[PDB]
Amino acid sequence: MEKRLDYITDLMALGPTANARTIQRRQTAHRLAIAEAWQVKPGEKILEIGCGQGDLSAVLADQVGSSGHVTGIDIASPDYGAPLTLGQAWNHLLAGPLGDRLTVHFNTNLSDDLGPIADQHFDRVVLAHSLWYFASANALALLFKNMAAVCDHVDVAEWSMQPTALDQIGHLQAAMIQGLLYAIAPSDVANIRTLITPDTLAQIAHDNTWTYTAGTIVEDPTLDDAHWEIATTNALLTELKLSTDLRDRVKPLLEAMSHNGTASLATFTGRITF
Amino acid sequence: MEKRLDYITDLMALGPTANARTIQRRQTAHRLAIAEAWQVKPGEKILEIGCGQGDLSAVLADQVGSSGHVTGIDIASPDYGAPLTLGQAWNHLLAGPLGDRLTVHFNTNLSDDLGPIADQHFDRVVLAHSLWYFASANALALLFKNMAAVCDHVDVAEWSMQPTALDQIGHLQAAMIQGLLYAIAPSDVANIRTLITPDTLAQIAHDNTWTYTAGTIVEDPTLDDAHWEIATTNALLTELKLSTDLRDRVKPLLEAMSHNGTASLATFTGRITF
Numbered sequence: 306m307e308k309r310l311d312y313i314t315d316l317m318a319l320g321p322t323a324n325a326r327t328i329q330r331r332q333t334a335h336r337l338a339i340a341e342a343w344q345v346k347p348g349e350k351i352l353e354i355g356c357g358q359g360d361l362s363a364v365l366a367d368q369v370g371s372s373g374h375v376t377g378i379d380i381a382s383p384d385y386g387a388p389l390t391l392g393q394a395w396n397h398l399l400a401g402p403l404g405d406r407l408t409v410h411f412n413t414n415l416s417d418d419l420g421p422i423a424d425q426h427f428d429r430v431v432l433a434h435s436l437w438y439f440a441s442a443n444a445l446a447l448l449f450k451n452m453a454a455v456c457d458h459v460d461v462a463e464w465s466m467q468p469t470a471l472d473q474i475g476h477l478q479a480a481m482i483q484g485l486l487y488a489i490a491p492s493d494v495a496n497i498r499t500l501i502t503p504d505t506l507a508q509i510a511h512d513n514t515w516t517y518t519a520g521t522i523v524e525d526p527t528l529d530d531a532h533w534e535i536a537t538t539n540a541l542l543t544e545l546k547l548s549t550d551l552r553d554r555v556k557p558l559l560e561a562m563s564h565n566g567t568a569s570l571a572t573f574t575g576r577i578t579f
Numbered sequence: 580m581e582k583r584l585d586y587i588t589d590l591m592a593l594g595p596t597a598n599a600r601t602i603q604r605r606q607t608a609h610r611l612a613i614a615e616a617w618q619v620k621p622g623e624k625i626l627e628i629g630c631g632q633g634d635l636s637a638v639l640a641d642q643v644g645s646s647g648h649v650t651g652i653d654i655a656s657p658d659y660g661a662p663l664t665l666g667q668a669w670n671h672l673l674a675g676p677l678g679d680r681l682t683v684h685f686n687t688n689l690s691d692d693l694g695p696i697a698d699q700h701f702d703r704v705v706l707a708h709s710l711w712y713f714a715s716a717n718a719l720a721l722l723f724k725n726m727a728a729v730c731d732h733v734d735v736a737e738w739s740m741q742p743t744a745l746d747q748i749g750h751l752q753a754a755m756i757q758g759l760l761y762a763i764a765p766s767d768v769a770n771i772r773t774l775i776t777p778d779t780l781a782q783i784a785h786d787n788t789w790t791y792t793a794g795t796i797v798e799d800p801t802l803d804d805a806h807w808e809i810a811t812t813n814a815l816l817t818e819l820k821l822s823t824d825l826r827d828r829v830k831p832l833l834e835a836m837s838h839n840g841t842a843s844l845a846t847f848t849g850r851i852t853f
C-alpha cells in the first residue's frame with residue numbers, strides 16, 4: 306500500500322462495477338513488481354509488445370519519468386474491449402498526467418516489419434504476459450530477431466508453470482488444457498496459443514546465438530487472472546468445434562481444475578541479450 | 580490391517596533385483612491401505628477388475644479368510660510381464676497359503692463377454708487403479724450396469740487429480756498429457772485412456788439411480804508410480820504417431836513437467852451402491 310501504487314492505479318480508466326478499482330490495483334501492483342524485477346530506471350525509452358489497455362505502459366511511464374518515453378504496440382484494434390475499449394483506456398492515459406510520455410500503435414504487428422517504430426532505438430523492449438499469445442515459438446523468435454534492430458535486449462515476464470502453492474494448480478490446468486487443445490487443433494477462437502517457458506526462451510536463444518538470463522520470480526496469487534482463465538477454459542470447451550469424444554475426454558480435466566484452487570501462478574522474468 | 584504387511588509381502592513371487600522386496604512391500608502396503616478404506620469383511624466373495632499380478636488380490640484373500648473368495652480379471656496374457664510374468668506371479672499365489680481363496684481369468688474383458696463369471700454372485704466388485712484404462716466413461720458405466728445384476732456395490736480406488744503436495748504435480752501432468760494424447764492418437768501401448776474422477780462416478784450414479792459415497796483418501800507419495808508414469812509420458816512422444824507440430828508443442832510441456840516433482844498422487848476411494 307504505497308502512495309505510488311494508489312497514484313498509478315488512479316490514473317487508469319475504470320469500468321463501473323463494484324470491484325473495478327480493487328481489481329485494477331492488483332493488476333497495477335503486479336506491473337510495478339515486474340518493473341522492479343527488470344530494474345527499469347528513470348530516463349529510459351521503452352517499447353512494449355502486447356500493451357493491451359496499458360496497465361504496464363502506465364507503470365513504465367511513471368517509472369521512466371518526464372524525460373522517458375514508453376511506446377505500446379498491440380495487434381488489437383482500439384475498438385476492442387468492454388466495458389472500456391482499448392482506445393478508451395489509452396485516450397484516458399493520453400489525456401492525463403503521463404500522457405506526454407506515452408504513444409500507442411494498435412493494429413500493429415512488428416514481426417511483419419518495424420513500420421511505426423521503423424527508425425527508432427529503445428533502451429529496452431519489454432513483453433509482460435503476451436508470450437502465451439504467440440502463434441508458435443518460432444513466431445516469438447522472429448519477433449525477437451526483428452527487435453535486435455531497435456535494441457540490444459528484450460526483457461520478458463510470463464506465468465510460470467511451476468506452481469509455488471497448491472491453490473495455483475487450477476490456473477496451471479487452465480493453461481495446459483488451452484495449450485494442448487490449440488496444439489491438437491488450432492482455432493481463431495483461442496486465447497492462449499503457445500505455452501512458452503524459460504526453457505523455450507533458452508532454446509530460442511541457443512538457436513539464434515543469443516543469451517537468455519533468468520531473473521527473479523514475481524508472486525501475485527491474489528490476481529484475478531486464475532479465475533478468469535479457469536472460466537475461459539470452461540467457456541472454450543463449449544465454444545470450440547470439438548468431437549463429442551474429445552469434449553467428453555476433456556471433461557474430467559475440467560472437474561479436477563474446479564477443485565485445484567483459484568490463486569494465480571507465480572510469474573517468471575528474464576532477458577534475451579542479442 | 581497393516582499388521583499383515585510382511586506376511587502378505589512374503590507370499591509374493593519377487594523378480595531378481597536387490598530391492599524387489601522393498602518395492603513389493605510398498606505396493607502391498609498401498610493395497611492394504613485401500614482394503615482398509617473399503618472395509619473388507621471375513622467371508623466375502625469379491626470380484627476384482629484389473630488384478631494385474633495380484634498385489635491387491637492377495638491382500639483381499641488374506642482379509643476375507645478361508646470362508647471368502649477372490650476372483651481376479653485381467654485383460655492381459657499369462658505370459659505378460661518382465662522380469663516376472665503375470666502367470667508366474669499368479670501360479671505362485673495359487674500354489675501357496677492363499678491359493679484356495681483365489682481365481683484368475685487372464686485375457687478377460689467383461690465388457691465384451693460376461694461368460695467367464697456366468698451364474699456367479701459376489702458381495703462386491705472392486706477396481707483399484709484400473710479405472711483409467713477404460714475405453715471411455717460410458718464403457719465404465721455400462722460395466723457397472725452389468726455388475727448391478729450380480730453384486731450389492733462396487734468399490735473403487737484411483738489416483739486423485741487433486742495434488743496434496745507440490746511434488747505430486749508432475750504425476751498429475753503426466754496423467755493429463757497422456758489423457759489428451761489418447762483422445763487424438765490412441766495406441767494399444769497406451770494404458771491411461773480415459774481419466775475418471777469422483778465427479779465422473781457421482782454422475783454415473785446419478786444417471787442410473789445409484790448412490791456414490793466418497794470414501795477416505797489414501798496418501799502414498801513414496802510409491803514409484805509417479806516416476807514410471809512421468810517416464811511413460813516422455814516416451815509416448817516417441818511411440819505415438821503424432822504430427823510434427825503437436826510433437827513440438829508437447830515437447831516443452833514435458834520439460835515443464837520435469838520441474839514439478841516426482842512424488843505419487845493421493846488415491847481417492849469410494850463406493851457405488853446399486
Ligand SMILES: [Cl-]
Nearest residue numbers: 602605802803
Ligand atoms: Cl513402489
